[PDB]
């Protein structure tokens, strides 16, 4: 297989957001969390409270330059189905993915030597013009 | 259908007074870092009527445009649009539906605040001593 | 006249550096100074006895974008002669000039509404590969 | 001779890393992807092989120039994943914030080292796929 | 006229803060500045281009006790308008005012025989619960 | 809702302690007398449960406001010697010197923790008498 | 039993002083000693050079507030007799006592987490007006 | 029997020149921390005769008043009492036997020095620019 | 007149110290101030309200050798009276004076081409053996 | 009494050392050559025996004055290689740079200690020849 | 045989303009530390002809004189010697072959650079405000 | 035996230099090397690449004052021959030697508590007037 890029275009302004929050080992201050707008979704995600994220969603942080980091992903079939069914951009999710962070995003990941303590997905809702904005594409 | 178009950098002209967009978030992390965006260069200061308020004329909306960048979307009432276009040093740049792009660092901040806007304002900043000489040059 | 750009190329790796230290009105004690590498010079800029860079310079910060700022300057006739004779890049200095700050450096000027409290000159030396680097 | 850039493409996602860490009188910079760990002889130290010079390259950006002795160069070029990127005369670019930090320190480096960073759980799969 | 007290209640938890940074004549390099949280404001106090707080203010430290000191101030007409329009507490600012330093803060003014070297304004932001706190 | 004060009376001489320690970008504050040690689950950390906000409350004094997640609140209220003092929204007052320190740091907290402090030789006798 | 407060009023100005000096674990600089004027005495204390203070006098430092500490005491009968016989205020000493320190006094005790390294009593003499002052009560 | 009475805070009047009591201890810990006590507000500066000295007019005595607080006790000769009362902005506050209270921090310092006074003085401090306007207001 | 030497002996171990803090034009943010123990005094030098040491002093750094520098000063009449009445060493202060910097202290003045940005006065206390030491 | 200088001649090349180390609110000063290591009783600490006072002695140089309790004095005088150099009242001189450092700290010492430094490979031969 | 004689400290006269010798090394360690040596006090500024250069008039050579100290040896052309002697406040101190001694700290620096001179110059420094009053006194 | 001083006078200006470089344990920054001009030599030193310096040349750093250090030396017969034959000052080298460093030289040695990591001899060549200078003695 290969690891396919999850590109920026899966973020569609005005649609609720799925956010991947990452905390690194030795992080003390919370403004050190790496928060990544991950996917725009038609409705918020809800996983079976029984199931854990760690069993359906593996992440891995690697260096990609002198101040860049990439995030690599393993996504279980059942979550890929769920995510593909929520995603506003049409079915962008594959089993093996990655996305590139910019230099600003990468600062704390480089400092913790890519050592991850905890991660999660969080549903982030929309602002006052959200419907208008998504309705307004050219 | 209308379109959301970009208020680009060219609308800031060096030497002219500045209209500054100031946004505060609800649960923004890190202290003493503000979101101050020079918004539009103006020939004369903005002055809204005393009884009416800004949020009757001006609505904003911060959303993500990708895995790192964030845009402020906004809707501008017809009255403030005429006023702002008439004051604007750049020729009539203002439209009813727009956005401006945040930079890499500002995006990070807005993301960290979960895009959650507590308030915002528009403030007049004057010019330094060489201002007159800079615009007339 | 026109305000002509003092561009990045007048900083040449391996030569001592002329630097502009700026303090903005407001902010916090925690705030570092804004420190702008300004000109690569043959040798340290020495001012006449009892003088300061404020005595030959006049600066004015103006926005140039949604997160960008330029610094505009007016440079006195004698300092103009001085900096043109120390400059590594051939005679880059004019009386009316500006330089463009990046989106990091502008952050500090914008939150102070462009208002400078003070500035002064600093001279910076070169490390152990300096001459080697400029030769290459 | 000329100081050639050690470009970002010497970093290969999936393989272990050499982190350049620098204390100005602090920054971490991934430096080189390697096939095996670096470990100098017991009775030498990095500064026997490696000189660092931090230098301004514009009105905001800063480069780190460095000179690599021949023994460290043949060693690093053998361990490197990317094929023989290392030369005697080189530089690398710091970002907007690293630069500022460097400027604030008047470019004075107090110390520096090279540290082996192992890889994540998908590491071997990323590079092998 | 009378010197009216700018009391503690004009600092309101959860709002940005206006601060007065004072340097006293004498003392030591080790001495921290005297930093007095002065006014809670809607937004940061921005001064007109090229101006400083010294240009609108006049301060005078006098003892008020065996280990107590007050700061007296005379506030210029335009800054008076400005601070009364940013104030969170409703219009607390008068032209002639004083504030009472505590027995810790007075220690620093008394050992300098009340003599100020300089002062300037600082603006301080709010943490992650700021708006939450002011709402409650 | 309202931020209620965590008063001094939650400190009971004789019983072990929870020390709030805070590093501004340093102060120790006895925080809560507890019957048994606090120890969070292995895979969480304090800042998952606990937000701190330092704020000026006059011309000299400073308070620390904080928000406590429900799990940490039920946990702390069970261990507490004083009966259920802990709420979701609270503050505590710093002294004249702590305040100054806080002001000098522009109220910026770099880190904070909660540490178990055992008791002295008369500890059990003090509380039991 | 209970632990009885040794109140300020046992300090009678103009009379020599008994001082309790406390040093904490990890104290480096001597201006970190906690010195407490403990009792006013008619004459200086002198314990049998044979006997140790630690056998007749136990101390214990506890928290009492967010920046307050209290000192708790166990006083052997023989020292209580001795102290009661020296004390200017009439017989204030009991077997189980405590006194409250203010916030200023408590700073280094809070920093060492109440961990005591060493303590002692010291006789502190009087100034030039001492007799006049003690003679002058209203 | 006489009594030792308190020289209270009210005898310091803002806007008037200050008579400052300065005490040095023998083995005081911590450097650059002085014991400077503003002592009495005066209409005109104090000036003792050149030949005579302060310790012929003024005697001080630092003692503890409890487990934390410390008082400076003092005895003031009849000549300096007349002089000080005549100079005092507050109406005749000075008596022959007095004390003033030290604060929590100063007590700690005096305790740490074992109350052991090396020397002391009385020094005139002037007024700032608003002084005149503050007392006549 | 002549510039008379303020010699080392006017610093007397065990007494508070009067110090001159100097900032030179140029250099680096990293540069410590040049701090010269200047006079041992009975008590702290207190200046009149609103005044600074620059208001009574005039200084001029000149070289005295291949790595040596002296500081020359002109001292105003009232400050002359003040420092002569606080001096521990009997009346050492004249209107025109100089003091000799050592090869370490001159290093800092020479690299700035003798050019001072500012100076101010500092007062330094004494440790726990101070009076003991001066008595001995 | 008088504060007498602890001169350089109390340092005897070849014999182990007592290093005076001082942290201003950092300097190492060889202090005394000793025949055997110093080790205080378990329940005491240096500052019980030893007071330090840093003081300016000219327009550039600084001395460290110190007072040595009688027990530490008899102990140090027995271990000393040079014969009984130690008195109750003493001082030592700092160099041009140590001084500057001391001045920069407003002479404020945060801590100080005495550390045993063993000897080199020729140590015993140097002193015995 | 000629001799290399010392340019001693006496040739620097306080109150007069300074001729400063500035030396840069090739691989000198430590940043922002320069080798600036005040070289000779002069009545008027030095000004070499525009076409000719310093290294045609002036040659320097840094060597060790022992286990710690280092001397700068130099050779001075006949033209610059006449010029420098005529400008020199001190009476004719310059000869064709000389040296000056470096101090303990400067020696260390020169040693660390392996004595390896990259370039050097002579620069005029003026006088402070009391200059006139200092030399005429 | 005794340890004989290797005095400054063995440095003869204008003649190439032999330099003893010393690095101390815990030295991080290279401007912390102690470099000592050791001997002036008629030609550069060249030891049999087979042989090590450590077998022919032992060094030892000792304290000699509150800010002074001395370096003590053991020099094998074969290197003494070699050094004596190179040395410009006539035959100054003995088996047991020492030299005194000044206070400036001693700073980093005192900081590392005299603990040596590595040392070596390095040949340092001469400047543009070197021959003239050595020819010019009075
Ligand atoms: N995404 C977004 N949310 C905003 C904005 N302004 C206020 N908010 C609030 O922040 C929340 C998302 O972080 C939204 O509430 P809701 O998501 O709970 O409906 C929304 O009401 C904005 O400009 N963008
Ligand atoms: N590079 C990398 N390391 C990780 C990640 N998550 C956890 N780690 C841990 O951090 C270490 C690298 O800093 C690895 O251990 P290892 O180096 O002992 O193999 C690994 O266990 C990740 O996403 N990327
Ligand atoms: N709280 C307290 N602890 C003390 C005191 N004296 C010594 N200690 C020691 O300090 C520790 C608390 O900081 C205790 O150990 P423990 O916590 O392992 O029981 C105790 O042994 C004291 O007076 N009070
Ligand atoms: N208690 C006290 N002692 C003083 C004072 N001034 C000087 N001293 C000296 O300090 C000592 C007590 O610390 C006293 O000596 P004595 O106690 O040895 O008799 C006393 O002489 C003072 O004001 N109060
Ligand atoms: N004093 C000294 N110690 C050295 C030297 N070289 C190495 N050392 C080591 O440093 C230590 C002293 O700091 C010694 O160990 P030791 O103290 O355990 O005997 C010794 O092994 C030297 O030249 N002088
Ligand atoms: N010793 C010395 N070397 C110098 C000087 N100026 C330049 N150099 C160069 O430094 C080198 C010695 O460190 C010399 O080259 P070389 O020794 O390779 O011949 C020499 O050319 C100087 O003034 N003294
Ligand atoms: Cl995609
Ligand atoms: Cl667009
Ligand atoms: Cl544009
Ligand atoms: Cl360019
Ligand atoms: Cl300047
Ligand atoms: Cl109030
Ligand atoms: Cl200001
Ligand atoms: Cl009682
Ligand atoms: Cl009373
Ligand atoms: Cl009162
Ligand atoms: Cl002298
Ligand atoms: Cl001043
Ligand atoms: Cl000579
Ligand atoms: Cl001379
Ligand atoms: Cl010899």
Swiss-Prot record, chains B, H, K:
Name of the protein in question: Matrix protein
Xref: Gene3D superfamilies: Borna disease virus, matrix protein
Keywords associated with the record: Host cell membrane, Host cytoplasm, Host membrane, Membrane, Viral matrix protein, Virion
Compartments (UniProt record): Virion; Host cytoplasm; Host cell membrane
Main location class: virion
GO CC terms: host cell cytoplasm; host cell plasma membrane; membrane; virion component
Keyword match Transport: no
Chain's role: Plays a crucial role in virion assembly and budding.
Topology in the lipid bilayer: Peripheral membrane protein
GO molecular function: identical protein binding; structural constituent of virion
Any Pfam family hit: Matrix_Borna
UniProt subunit comment: Homooligomer. Homotetramer. Interacts with phosphoprotein P. Binds to ssRNA.
Transmembrane segments: none
This protein's record includes keyword Membrane: yes
UniProt-annotated binding residues for GMP: 61-63, 114
Maturation and modification: Not glycosylated.
Swiss-Prot record, chains D, F, J:
Gene3D superfamilies: Borna disease virus, matrix protein
Positions of GMP binding: 53-55, 106
Residue ranges of the TM segments: none
UniProt cross-references to InterPro entries, sorted A to Z: BDV_M (IPR032414), BDV_M_sf (IPR038520)
Organism whose genome encodes this protein: Borna disease virus 1 (BoDV-1)
Gene of this entry: M
Cellular compartment(s): Virion; Host cytoplasm; Host cell membrane
GO cellular component: host cell cytoplasm; host cell plasma membrane; membrane; virion component
Effect annotated for changing residue 97 to D: In strain: Isolate H1 and Isolate H2
UniProt main location, coarse: virion
UniProt GO MF annotations: identical protein binding; structural constituent of virion
PTMs per UniProt: Not glycosylated.
Top-rank lineage group of the source organism: Viruses
Stated name of the protein: Matrix protein
Subunit structure: Homooligomer. Homotetramer. Interacts with phosphoprotein P. Binds to ssRNA.
Membrane topology summary: Peripheral membrane protein
Biological role stated in the UniProt entry: Plays a crucial role in virion assembly and budding.
UniProt keywords, alphabetically: Host cell membrane, Host cytoplasm, Host membrane, Membrane, Viral matrix protein, Virion
